[PDB]
JSON list of C-alpha atoms in Angstrom, two decimals:
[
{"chain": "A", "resi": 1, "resn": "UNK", "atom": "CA", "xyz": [48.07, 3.35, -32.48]},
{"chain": "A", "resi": 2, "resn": "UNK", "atom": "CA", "xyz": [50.67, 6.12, -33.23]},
{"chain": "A", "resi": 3, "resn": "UNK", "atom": "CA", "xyz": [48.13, 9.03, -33.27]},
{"chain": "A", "resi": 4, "resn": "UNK", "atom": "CA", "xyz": [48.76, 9.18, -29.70]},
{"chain": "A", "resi": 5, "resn": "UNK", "atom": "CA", "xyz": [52.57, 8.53, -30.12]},
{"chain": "A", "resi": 6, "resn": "UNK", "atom": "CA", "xyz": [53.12, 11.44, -32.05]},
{"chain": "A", "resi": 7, "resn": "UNK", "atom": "CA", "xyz": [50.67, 13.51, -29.83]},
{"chain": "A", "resi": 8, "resn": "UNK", "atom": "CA", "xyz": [51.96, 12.15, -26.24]},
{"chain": "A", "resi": 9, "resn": "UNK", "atom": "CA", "xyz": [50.33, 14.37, -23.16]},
{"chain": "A", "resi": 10, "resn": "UNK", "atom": "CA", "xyz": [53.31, 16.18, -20.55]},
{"chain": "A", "resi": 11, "resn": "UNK", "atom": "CA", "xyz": [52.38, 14.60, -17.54]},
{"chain": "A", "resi": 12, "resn": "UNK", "atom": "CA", "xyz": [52.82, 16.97, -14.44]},
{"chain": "A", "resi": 13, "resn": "UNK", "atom": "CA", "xyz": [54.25, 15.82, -11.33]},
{"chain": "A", "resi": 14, "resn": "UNK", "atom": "CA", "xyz": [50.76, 15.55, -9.39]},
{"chain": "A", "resi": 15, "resn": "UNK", "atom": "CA", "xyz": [47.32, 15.68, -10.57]},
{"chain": "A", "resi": 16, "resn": "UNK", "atom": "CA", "xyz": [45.23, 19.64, -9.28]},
{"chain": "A", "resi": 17, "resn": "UNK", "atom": "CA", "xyz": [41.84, 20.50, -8.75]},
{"chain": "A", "resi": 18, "resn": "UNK", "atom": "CA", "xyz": [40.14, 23.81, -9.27]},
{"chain": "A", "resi": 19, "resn": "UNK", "atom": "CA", "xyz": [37.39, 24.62, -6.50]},
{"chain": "A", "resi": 20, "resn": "UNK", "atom": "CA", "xyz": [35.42, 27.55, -7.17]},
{"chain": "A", "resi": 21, "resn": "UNK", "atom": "CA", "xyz": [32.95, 29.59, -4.42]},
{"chain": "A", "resi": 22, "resn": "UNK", "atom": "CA", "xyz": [30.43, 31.42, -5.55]},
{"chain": "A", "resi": 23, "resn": "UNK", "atom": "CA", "xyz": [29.57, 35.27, -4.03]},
{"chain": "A", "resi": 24, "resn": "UNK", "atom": "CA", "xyz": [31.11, 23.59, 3.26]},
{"chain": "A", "resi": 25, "resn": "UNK", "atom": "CA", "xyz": [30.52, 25.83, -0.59]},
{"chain": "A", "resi": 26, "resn": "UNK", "atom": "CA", "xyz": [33.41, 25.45, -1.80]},
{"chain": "A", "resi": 27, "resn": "UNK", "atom": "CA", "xyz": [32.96, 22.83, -5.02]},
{"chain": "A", "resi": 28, "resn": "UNK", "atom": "CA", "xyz": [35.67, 21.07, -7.34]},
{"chain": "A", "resi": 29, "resn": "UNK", "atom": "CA", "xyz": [35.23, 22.42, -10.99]},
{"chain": "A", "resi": 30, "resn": "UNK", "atom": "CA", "xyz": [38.15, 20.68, -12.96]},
{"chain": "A", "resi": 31, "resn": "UNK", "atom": "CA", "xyz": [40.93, 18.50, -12.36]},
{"chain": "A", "resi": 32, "resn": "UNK", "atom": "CA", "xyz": [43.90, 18.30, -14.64]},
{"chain": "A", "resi": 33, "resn": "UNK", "atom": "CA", "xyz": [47.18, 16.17, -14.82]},
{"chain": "A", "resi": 34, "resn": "UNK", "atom": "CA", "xyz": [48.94, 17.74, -18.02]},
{"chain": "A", "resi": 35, "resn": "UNK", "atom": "CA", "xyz": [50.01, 20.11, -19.84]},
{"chain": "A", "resi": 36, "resn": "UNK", "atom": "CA", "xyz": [47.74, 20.36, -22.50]},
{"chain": "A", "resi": 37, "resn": "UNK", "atom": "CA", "xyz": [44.90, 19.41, -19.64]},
{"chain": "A", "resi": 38, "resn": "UNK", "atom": "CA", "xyz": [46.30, 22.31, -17.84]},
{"chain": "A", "resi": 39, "resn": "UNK", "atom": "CA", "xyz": [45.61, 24.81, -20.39]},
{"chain": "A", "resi": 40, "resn": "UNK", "atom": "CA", "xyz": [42.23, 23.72, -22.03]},
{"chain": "A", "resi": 41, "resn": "UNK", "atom": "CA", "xyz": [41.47, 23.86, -18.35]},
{"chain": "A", "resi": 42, "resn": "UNK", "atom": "CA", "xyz": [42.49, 27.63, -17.83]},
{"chain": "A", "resi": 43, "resn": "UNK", "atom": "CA", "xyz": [41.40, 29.05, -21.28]},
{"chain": "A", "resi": 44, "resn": "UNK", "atom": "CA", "xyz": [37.91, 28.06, -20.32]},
{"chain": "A", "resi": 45, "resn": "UNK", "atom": "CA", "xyz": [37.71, 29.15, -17.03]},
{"chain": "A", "resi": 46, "resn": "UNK", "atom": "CA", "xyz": [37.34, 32.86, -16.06]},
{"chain": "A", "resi": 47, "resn": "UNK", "atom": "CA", "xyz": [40.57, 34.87, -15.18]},
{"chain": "A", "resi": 48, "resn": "UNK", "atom": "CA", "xyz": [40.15, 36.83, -11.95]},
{"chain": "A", "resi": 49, "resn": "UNK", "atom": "CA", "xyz": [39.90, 40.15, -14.26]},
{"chain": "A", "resi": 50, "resn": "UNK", "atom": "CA", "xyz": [35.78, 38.73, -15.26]},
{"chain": "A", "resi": 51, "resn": "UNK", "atom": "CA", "xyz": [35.27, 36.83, -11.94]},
{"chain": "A", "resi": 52, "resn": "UNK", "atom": "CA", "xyz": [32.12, 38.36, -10.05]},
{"chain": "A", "resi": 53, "resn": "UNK", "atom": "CA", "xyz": [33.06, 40.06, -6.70]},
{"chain": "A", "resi": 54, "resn": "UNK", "atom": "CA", "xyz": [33.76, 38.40, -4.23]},
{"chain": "A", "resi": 55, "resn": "UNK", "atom": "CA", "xyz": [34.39, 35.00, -5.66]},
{"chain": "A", "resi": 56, "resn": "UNK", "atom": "CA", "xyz": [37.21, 32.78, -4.39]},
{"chain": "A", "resi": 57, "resn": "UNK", "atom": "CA", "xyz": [38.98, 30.64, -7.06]},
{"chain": "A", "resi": 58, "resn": "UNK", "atom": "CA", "xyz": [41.51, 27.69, -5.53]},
{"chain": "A", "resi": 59, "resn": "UNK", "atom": "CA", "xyz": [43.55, 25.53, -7.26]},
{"chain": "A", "resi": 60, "resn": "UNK", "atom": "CA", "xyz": [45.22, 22.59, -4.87]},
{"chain": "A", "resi": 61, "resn": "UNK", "atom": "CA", "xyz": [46.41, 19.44, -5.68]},
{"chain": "A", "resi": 62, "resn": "UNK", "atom": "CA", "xyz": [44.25, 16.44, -5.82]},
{"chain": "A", "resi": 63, "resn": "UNK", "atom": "CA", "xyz": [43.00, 15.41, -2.84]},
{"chain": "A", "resi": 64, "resn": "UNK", "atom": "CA", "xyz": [43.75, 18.05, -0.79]},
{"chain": "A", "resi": 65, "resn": "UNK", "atom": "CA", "xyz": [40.51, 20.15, -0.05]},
{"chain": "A", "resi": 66, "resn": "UNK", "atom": "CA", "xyz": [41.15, 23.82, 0.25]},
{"chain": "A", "resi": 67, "resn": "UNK", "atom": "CA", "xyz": [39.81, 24.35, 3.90]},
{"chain": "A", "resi": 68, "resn": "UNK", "atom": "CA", "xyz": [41.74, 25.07, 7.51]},
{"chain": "A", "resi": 69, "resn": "UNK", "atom": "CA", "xyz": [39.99, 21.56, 8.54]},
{"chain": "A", "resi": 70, "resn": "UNK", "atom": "CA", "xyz": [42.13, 19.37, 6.00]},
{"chain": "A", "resi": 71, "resn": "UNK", "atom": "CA", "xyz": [44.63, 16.91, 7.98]},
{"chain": "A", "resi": 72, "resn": "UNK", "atom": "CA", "xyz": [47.45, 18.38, 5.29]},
{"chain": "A", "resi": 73, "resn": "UNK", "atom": "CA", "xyz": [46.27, 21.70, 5.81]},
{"chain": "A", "resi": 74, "resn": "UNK", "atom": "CA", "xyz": [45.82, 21.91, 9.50]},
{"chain": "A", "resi": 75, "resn": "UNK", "atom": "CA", "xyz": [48.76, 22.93, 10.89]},
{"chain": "A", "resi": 76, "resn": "UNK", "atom": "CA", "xyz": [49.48, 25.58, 7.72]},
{"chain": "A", "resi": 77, "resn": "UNK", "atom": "CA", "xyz": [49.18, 29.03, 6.90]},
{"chain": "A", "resi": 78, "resn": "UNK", "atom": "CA", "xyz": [48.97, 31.00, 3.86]},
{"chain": "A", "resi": 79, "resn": "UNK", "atom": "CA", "xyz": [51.11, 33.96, 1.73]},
{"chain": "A", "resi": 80, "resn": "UNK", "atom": "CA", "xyz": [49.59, 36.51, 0.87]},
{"chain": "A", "resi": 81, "resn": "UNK", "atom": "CA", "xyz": [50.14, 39.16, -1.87]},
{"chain": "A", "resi": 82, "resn": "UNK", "atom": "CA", "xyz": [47.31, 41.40, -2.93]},
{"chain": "A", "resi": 83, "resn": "UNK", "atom": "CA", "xyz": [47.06, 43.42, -6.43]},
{"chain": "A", "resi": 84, "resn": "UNK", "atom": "CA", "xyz": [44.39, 46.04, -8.46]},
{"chain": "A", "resi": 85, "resn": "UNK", "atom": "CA", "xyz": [41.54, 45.21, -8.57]},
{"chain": "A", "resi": 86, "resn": "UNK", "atom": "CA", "xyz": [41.55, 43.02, -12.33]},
{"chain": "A", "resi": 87, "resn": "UNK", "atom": "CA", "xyz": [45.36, 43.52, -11.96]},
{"chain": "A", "resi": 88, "resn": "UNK", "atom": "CA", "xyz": [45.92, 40.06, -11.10]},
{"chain": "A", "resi": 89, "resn": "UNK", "atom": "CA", "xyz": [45.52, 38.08, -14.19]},
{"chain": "A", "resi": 90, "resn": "UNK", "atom": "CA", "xyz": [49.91, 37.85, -14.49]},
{"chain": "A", "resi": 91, "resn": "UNK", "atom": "CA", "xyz": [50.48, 37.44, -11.16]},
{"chain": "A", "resi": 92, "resn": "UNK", "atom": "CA", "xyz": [47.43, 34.40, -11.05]},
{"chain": "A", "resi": 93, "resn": "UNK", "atom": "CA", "xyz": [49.42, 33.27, -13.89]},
{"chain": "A", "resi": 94, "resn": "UNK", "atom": "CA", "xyz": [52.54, 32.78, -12.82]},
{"chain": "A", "resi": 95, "resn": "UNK", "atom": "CA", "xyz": [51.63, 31.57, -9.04]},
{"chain": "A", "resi": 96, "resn": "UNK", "atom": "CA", "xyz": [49.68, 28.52, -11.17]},
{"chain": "A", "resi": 97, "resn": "UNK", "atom": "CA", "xyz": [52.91, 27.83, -13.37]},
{"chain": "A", "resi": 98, "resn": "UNK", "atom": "CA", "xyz": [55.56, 27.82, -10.44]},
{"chain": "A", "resi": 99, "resn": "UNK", "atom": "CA", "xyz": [53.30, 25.41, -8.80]},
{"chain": "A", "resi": 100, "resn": "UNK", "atom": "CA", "xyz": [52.00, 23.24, -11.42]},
{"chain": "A", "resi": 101, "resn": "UNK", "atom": "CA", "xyz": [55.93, 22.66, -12.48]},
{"chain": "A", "resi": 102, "resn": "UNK", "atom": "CA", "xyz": [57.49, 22.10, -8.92]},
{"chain": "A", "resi": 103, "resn": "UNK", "atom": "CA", "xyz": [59.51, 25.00, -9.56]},
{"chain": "A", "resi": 104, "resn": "UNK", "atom": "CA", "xyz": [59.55, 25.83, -5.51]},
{"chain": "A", "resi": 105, "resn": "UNK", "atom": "CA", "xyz": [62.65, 24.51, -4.05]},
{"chain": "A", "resi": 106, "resn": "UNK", "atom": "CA", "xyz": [60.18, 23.86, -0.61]},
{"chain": "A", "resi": 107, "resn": "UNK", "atom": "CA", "xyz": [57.66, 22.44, -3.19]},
{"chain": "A", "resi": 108, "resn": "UNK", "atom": "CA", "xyz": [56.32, 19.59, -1.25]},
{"chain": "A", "resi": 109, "resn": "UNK", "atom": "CA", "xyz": [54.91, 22.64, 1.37]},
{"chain": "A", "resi": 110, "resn": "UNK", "atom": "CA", "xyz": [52.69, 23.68, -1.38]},
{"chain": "A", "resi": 111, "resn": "UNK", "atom": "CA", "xyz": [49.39, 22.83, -0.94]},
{"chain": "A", "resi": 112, "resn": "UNK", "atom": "CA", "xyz": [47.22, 24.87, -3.31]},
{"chain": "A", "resi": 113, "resn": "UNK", "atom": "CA", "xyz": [46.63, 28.39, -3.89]},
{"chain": "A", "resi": 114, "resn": "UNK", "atom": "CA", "xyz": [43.66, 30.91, -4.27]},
{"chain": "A", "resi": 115, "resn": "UNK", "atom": "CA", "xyz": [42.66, 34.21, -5.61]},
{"chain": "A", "resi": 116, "resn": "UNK", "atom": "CA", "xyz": [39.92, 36.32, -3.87]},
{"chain": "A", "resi": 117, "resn": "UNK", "atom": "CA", "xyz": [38.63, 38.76, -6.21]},
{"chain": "A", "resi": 118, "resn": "UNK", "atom": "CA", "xyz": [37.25, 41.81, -4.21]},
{"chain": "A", "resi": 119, "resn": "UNK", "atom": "CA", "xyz": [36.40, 45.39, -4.81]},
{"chain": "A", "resi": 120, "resn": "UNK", "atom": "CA", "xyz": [39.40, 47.78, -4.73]},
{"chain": "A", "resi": 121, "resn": "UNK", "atom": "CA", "xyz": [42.41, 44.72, -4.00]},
{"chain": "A", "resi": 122, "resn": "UNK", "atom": "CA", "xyz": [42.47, 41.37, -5.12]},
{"chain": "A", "resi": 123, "resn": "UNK", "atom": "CA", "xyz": [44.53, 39.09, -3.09]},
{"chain": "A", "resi": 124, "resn": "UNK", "atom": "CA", "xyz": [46.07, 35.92, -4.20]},
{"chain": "A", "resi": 125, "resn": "UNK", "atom": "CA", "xyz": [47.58, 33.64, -1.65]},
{"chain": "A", "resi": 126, "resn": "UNK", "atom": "CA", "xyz": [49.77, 30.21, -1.43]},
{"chain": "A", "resi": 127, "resn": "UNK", "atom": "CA", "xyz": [48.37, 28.52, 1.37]},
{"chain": "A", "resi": 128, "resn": "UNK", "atom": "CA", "xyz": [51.62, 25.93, 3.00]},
{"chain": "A", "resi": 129, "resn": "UNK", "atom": "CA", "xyz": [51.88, 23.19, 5.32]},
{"chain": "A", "resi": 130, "resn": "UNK", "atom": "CA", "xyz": [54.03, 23.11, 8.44]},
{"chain": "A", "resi": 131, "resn": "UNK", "atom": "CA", "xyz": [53.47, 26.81, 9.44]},
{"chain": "A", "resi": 132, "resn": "UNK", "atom": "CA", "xyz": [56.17, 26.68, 12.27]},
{"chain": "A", "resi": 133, "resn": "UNK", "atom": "CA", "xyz": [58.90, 25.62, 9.77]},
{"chain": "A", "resi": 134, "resn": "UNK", "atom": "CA", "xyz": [60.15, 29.81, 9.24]},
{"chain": "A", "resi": 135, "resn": "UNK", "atom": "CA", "xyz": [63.03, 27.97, 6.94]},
{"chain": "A", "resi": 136, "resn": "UNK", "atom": "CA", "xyz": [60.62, 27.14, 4.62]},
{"chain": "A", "resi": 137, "resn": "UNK", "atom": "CA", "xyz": [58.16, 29.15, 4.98]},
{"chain": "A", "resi": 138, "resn": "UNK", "atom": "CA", "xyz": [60.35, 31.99, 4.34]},
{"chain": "A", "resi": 139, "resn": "UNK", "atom": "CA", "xyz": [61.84, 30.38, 1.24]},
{"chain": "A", "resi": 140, "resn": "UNK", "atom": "CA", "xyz": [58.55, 30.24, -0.58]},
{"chain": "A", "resi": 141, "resn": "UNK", "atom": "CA", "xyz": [58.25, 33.39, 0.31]},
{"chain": "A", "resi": 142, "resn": "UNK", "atom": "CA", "xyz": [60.94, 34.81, -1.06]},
{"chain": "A", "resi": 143, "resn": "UNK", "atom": "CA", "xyz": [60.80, 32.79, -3.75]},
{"chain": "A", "resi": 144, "resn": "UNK", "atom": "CA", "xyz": [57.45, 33.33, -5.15]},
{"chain": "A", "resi": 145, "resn": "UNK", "atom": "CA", "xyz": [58.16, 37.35, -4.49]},
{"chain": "A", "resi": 146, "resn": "UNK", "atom": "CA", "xyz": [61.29, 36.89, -7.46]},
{"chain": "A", "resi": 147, "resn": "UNK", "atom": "CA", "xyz": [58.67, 34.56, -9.48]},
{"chain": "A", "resi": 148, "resn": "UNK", "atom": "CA", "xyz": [56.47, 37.68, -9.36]},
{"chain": "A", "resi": 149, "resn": "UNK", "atom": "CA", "xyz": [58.58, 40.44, -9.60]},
{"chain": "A", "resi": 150, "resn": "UNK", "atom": "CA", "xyz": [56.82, 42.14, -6.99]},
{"chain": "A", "resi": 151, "resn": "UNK", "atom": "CA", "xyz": [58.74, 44.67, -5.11]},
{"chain": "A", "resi": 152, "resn": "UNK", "atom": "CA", "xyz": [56.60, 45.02, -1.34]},
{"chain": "A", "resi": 153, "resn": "UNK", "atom": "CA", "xyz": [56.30, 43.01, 1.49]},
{"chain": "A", "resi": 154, "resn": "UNK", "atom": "CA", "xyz": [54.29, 40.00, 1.71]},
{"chain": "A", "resi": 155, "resn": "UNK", "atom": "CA", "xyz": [53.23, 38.09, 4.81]},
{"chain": "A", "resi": 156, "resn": "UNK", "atom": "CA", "xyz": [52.72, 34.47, 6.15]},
{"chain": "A", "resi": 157, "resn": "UNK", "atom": "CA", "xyz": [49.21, 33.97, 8.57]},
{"chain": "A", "resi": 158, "resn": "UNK", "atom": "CA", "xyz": [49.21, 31.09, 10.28]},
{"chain": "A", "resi": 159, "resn": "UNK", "atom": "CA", "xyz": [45.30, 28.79, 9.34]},
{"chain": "A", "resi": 160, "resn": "UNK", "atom": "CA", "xyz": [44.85, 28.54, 13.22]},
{"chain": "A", "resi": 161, "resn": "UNK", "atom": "CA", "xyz": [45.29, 31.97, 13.61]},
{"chain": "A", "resi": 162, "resn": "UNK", "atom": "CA", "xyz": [42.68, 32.78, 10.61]},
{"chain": "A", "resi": 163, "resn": "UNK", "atom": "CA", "xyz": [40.35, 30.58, 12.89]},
{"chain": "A", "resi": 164, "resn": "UNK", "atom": "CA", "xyz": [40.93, 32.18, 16.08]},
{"chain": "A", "resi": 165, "resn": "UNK", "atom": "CA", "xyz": [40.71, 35.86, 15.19]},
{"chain": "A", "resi": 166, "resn": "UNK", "atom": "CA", "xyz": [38.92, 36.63, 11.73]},
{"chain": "A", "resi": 167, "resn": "UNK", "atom": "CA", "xyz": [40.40, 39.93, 10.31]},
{"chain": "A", "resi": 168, "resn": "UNK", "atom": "CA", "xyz": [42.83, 40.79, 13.41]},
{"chain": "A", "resi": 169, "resn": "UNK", "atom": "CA", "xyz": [45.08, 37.77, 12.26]},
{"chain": "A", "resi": 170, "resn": "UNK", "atom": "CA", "xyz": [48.41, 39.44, 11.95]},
{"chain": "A", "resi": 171, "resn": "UNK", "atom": "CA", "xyz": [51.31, 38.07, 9.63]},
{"chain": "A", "resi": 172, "resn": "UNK", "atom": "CA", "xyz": [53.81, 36.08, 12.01]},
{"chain": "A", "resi": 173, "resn": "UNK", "atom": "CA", "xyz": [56.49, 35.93, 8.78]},
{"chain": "A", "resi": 174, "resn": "UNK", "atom": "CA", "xyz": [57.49, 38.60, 6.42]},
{"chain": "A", "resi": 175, "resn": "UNK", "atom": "CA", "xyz": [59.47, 38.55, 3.70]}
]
Protein backbone atom coordinates (compact mmCIF):
# COMPACT_ATOMS: atom_id res chain seq x y z
CA UNK A 1 0.00 0.00 0.00
CA UNK A 2 1.17 3.69 -0.27
CA UNK A 3 2.72 3.85 3.26
CA UNK A 4 5.72 2.62 1.63
CA UNK A 5 5.19 4.85 -1.51
CA UNK A 6 5.38 7.89 0.28
CA UNK A 7 8.27 6.51 2.51
CA UNK A 8 10.42 4.77 -0.45
CA UNK A 9 14.13 3.60 0.94
CA UNK A 10 17.45 5.32 -1.29
CA UNK A 11 18.89 2.32 -2.46
CA UNK A 12 22.81 2.53 -2.60
CA UNK A 13 24.71 1.25 -5.39
CA UNK A 14 25.94 -2.06 -3.51
CA UNK A 15 24.89 -3.59 -0.38
CA UNK A 16 28.17 -3.15 2.91
CA UNK A 17 28.93 -5.03 5.80
CA UNK A 18 30.38 -3.87 9.06
CA UNK A 19 32.96 -6.45 10.66
CA UNK A 20 34.05 -5.61 13.98
CA UNK A 21 37.34 -7.27 16.03
CA UNK A 22 37.40 -7.22 19.34
CA UNK A 23 40.85 -6.18 21.54
CA UNK A 24 39.90 -15.78 11.59
CA UNK A 25 38.09 -12.94 14.57
CA UNK A 26 37.04 -10.75 12.56
CA UNK A 27 32.87 -11.06 12.61
CA UNK A 28 30.10 -9.28 10.38
CA UNK A 29 27.93 -6.99 12.70
CA UNK A 30 25.46 -5.24 10.20
CA UNK A 31 24.80 -5.08 6.68
CA UNK A 32 22.99 -2.22 5.07
CA UNK A 33 21.75 -1.34 1.45
CA UNK A 34 20.19 2.27 2.04
CA UNK A 35 20.18 5.26 3.11
CA UNK A 36 18.07 5.25 5.91
CA UNK A 37 19.67 1.50 6.61
CA UNK A 38 22.91 3.27 6.45
CA UNK A 39 22.29 5.58 9.21
CA UNK A 40 20.17 3.56 11.80
CA UNK A 41 23.18 1.39 11.19
CA UNK A 42 25.87 4.06 12.23
CA UNK A 43 23.87 5.90 15.03
CA UNK A 44 23.89 2.62 16.86
CA UNK A 45 27.17 1.56 16.46
CA UNK A 46 30.12 3.10 18.40
CA UNK A 47 32.19 5.94 16.68
CA UNK A 48 35.92 5.30 16.94
CA UNK A 49 36.01 8.26 19.70
CA UNK A 50 34.17 5.28 22.46
CA UNK A 51 35.69 2.20 20.70
CA UNK A 52 37.96 0.21 23.30
CA UNK A 53 41.70 0.22 22.32
CA UNK A 54 42.75 -1.52 20.05
CA UNK A 55 39.62 -2.49 18.24
CA UNK A 56 39.47 -2.66 14.44
CA UNK A 57 36.15 -1.54 12.85
CA UNK A 58 35.76 -2.46 8.79
CA UNK A 59 33.19 -1.64 6.65
CA UNK A 60 33.46 -3.50 2.97
CA UNK A 61 31.01 -4.26 0.65
CA UNK A 62 29.01 -7.38 0.77
CA UNK A 63 30.74 -10.23 0.15
CA UNK A 64 33.99 -9.14 0.27
CA UNK A 65 35.67 -10.29 3.64
CA UNK A 66 38.11 -7.82 5.01
CA UNK A 67 41.29 -10.11 5.07
CA UNK A 68 44.72 -10.18 2.72
CA UNK A 69 43.39 -13.92 1.83
CA UNK A 70 40.16 -12.66 -0.11
CA UNK A 71 40.42 -13.51 -4.04
CA UNK A 72 39.26 -9.54 -4.50
CA UNK A 73 41.59 -8.54 -1.99
CA UNK A 74 44.66 -10.47 -2.80
CA UNK A 75 46.53 -8.66 -5.01
CA UNK A 76 45.57 -5.08 -3.06
CA UNK A 77 46.93 -2.78 -0.70
CA UNK A 78 45.65 -0.26 1.56
CA UNK A 79 45.78 3.91 2.22
CA UNK A 80 46.52 4.91 5.06
CA UNK A 81 45.91 8.17 7.00
CA UNK A 82 46.24 8.25 10.74
CA UNK A 83 44.61 11.00 13.22
CA UNK A 84 44.38 11.87 17.38
CA UNK A 85 43.66 9.61 19.17
CA UNK A 86 39.34 10.12 19.29
CA UNK A 87 40.12 12.65 16.50
CA UNK A 88 38.80 10.50 13.92
CA UNK A 89 35.13 10.54 14.23
CA UNK A 90 34.96 13.34 10.82
CA UNK A 91 37.43 11.84 9.02
CA UNK A 92 35.58 8.01 9.71
CA UNK A 93 32.72 9.97 8.55
CA UNK A 94 33.45 11.13 5.51
CA UNK A 95 35.72 8.00 4.26
CA UNK A 96 32.11 5.94 4.87
CA UNK A 97 30.09 8.64 2.77
CA UNK A 98 32.58 8.90 -0.29
CA UNK A 99 32.37 5.22 -0.40
CA UNK A 100 28.91 4.35 0.35
CA UNK A 101 27.91 7.00 -2.63
CA UNK A 102 30.52 5.93 -5.36
CA UNK A 103 31.81 9.28 -5.15
CA UNK A 104 35.57 7.84 -6.14
CA UNK A 105 36.12 8.31 -9.73
CA UNK A 106 38.39 4.69 -9.36
CA UNK A 107 35.34 3.48 -7.29
CA UNK A 108 35.15 -0.03 -8.44
CA UNK A 109 39.00 -0.34 -6.63
CA UNK A 110 37.29 0.21 -3.41
CA UNK A 111 36.97 -2.62 -1.47
CA UNK A 112 36.16 -1.61 2.11
CA UNK A 113 37.74 0.42 4.65
CA UNK A 114 38.79 0.25 8.41
CA UNK A 115 39.61 2.25 11.41
CA UNK A 116 42.11 0.94 14.06
CA UNK A 117 41.61 2.73 17.16
CA UNK A 118 44.95 2.74 19.17
CA UNK A 119 46.55 4.65 21.94
CA UNK A 120 48.16 7.96 20.88
CA UNK A 121 47.10 7.66 16.67
CA UNK A 122 44.22 6.21 15.22
CA UNK A 123 44.61 5.16 11.71
CA UNK A 124 41.92 4.77 9.21
CA UNK A 125 42.70 3.11 5.95
CA UNK A 126 40.96 2.33 2.35
CA UNK A 127 42.14 -0.93 1.56
CA UNK A 128 42.10 -1.23 -2.89
CA UNK A 129 42.35 -3.84 -5.36
CA UNK A 130 44.92 -4.03 -8.14
CA UNK A 131 47.88 -2.63 -6.07
CA UNK A 132 50.22 -2.36 -9.20
CA UNK A 133 47.72 -0.07 -11.01
CA UNK A 134 49.83 3.51 -9.55
CA UNK A 135 47.03 5.33 -11.96
CA UNK A 136 44.56 4.43 -9.75
CA UNK A 137 45.91 3.91 -6.91
CA UNK A 138 47.18 7.32 -6.86
CA UNK A 139 43.81 8.79 -7.79
CA UNK A 140 42.10 7.49 -4.71
CA UNK A 141 44.66 8.78 -3.10
CA UNK A 142 44.53 12.01 -3.94
CA UNK A 143 41.17 11.99 -3.99
CA UNK A 144 40.19 10.88 -0.63
CA UNK A 145 43.13 13.44 0.75
CA UNK A 146 40.62 16.57 -0.90
CA UNK A 147 37.49 14.48 0.58
CA UNK A 148 39.32 14.91 3.90
CA UNK A 149 40.87 18.03 3.84
CA UNK A 150 43.89 16.68 5.20
CA UNK A 151 46.99 18.53 4.42
CA UNK A 152 50.12 15.56 4.97
CA UNK A 153 51.19 12.79 3.15
CA UNK A 154 49.50 9.59 3.01
CA UNK A 155 50.81 6.27 1.74
CA UNK A 156 49.73 3.11 -0.27
CA UNK A 157 51.21 -0.59 1.34
CA UNK A 158 50.88 -3.16 -0.78
CA UNK A 159 48.57 -6.57 1.33
CA UNK A 160 51.53 -8.87 0.21
CA UNK A 161 53.88 -6.71 1.56
CA UNK A 162 51.82 -6.43 5.04
CA UNK A 163 52.24 -10.34 4.89
CA UNK A 164 55.78 -10.54 4.19
CA UNK A 165 57.23 -8.03 6.63
CA UNK A 166 54.81 -7.03 9.62
CA UNK A 167 55.69 -3.41 10.73
CA UNK A 168 58.82 -2.84 8.25
CA UNK A 169 56.22 -2.69 5.29
CA UNK A 170 57.12 0.58 3.72
CA UNK A 171 54.58 2.71 1.55
CA UNK A 172 55.46 1.94 -2.26
CA UNK A 173 52.89 5.11 -3.30
CA UNK A 174 52.62 8.50 -1.83
CA UNK A 175 50.50 11.03 -2.45
Amino acid sequence: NAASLVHQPHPLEHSWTFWFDNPASIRPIYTFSTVEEFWSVYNNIHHPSKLAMRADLYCFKHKIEPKWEDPVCANGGKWTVNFPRGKSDNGWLYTLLAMIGEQFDCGDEICGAVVNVRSGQDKISIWTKNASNEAAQASIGKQWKEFLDYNESIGFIFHDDAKKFDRHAKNKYMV
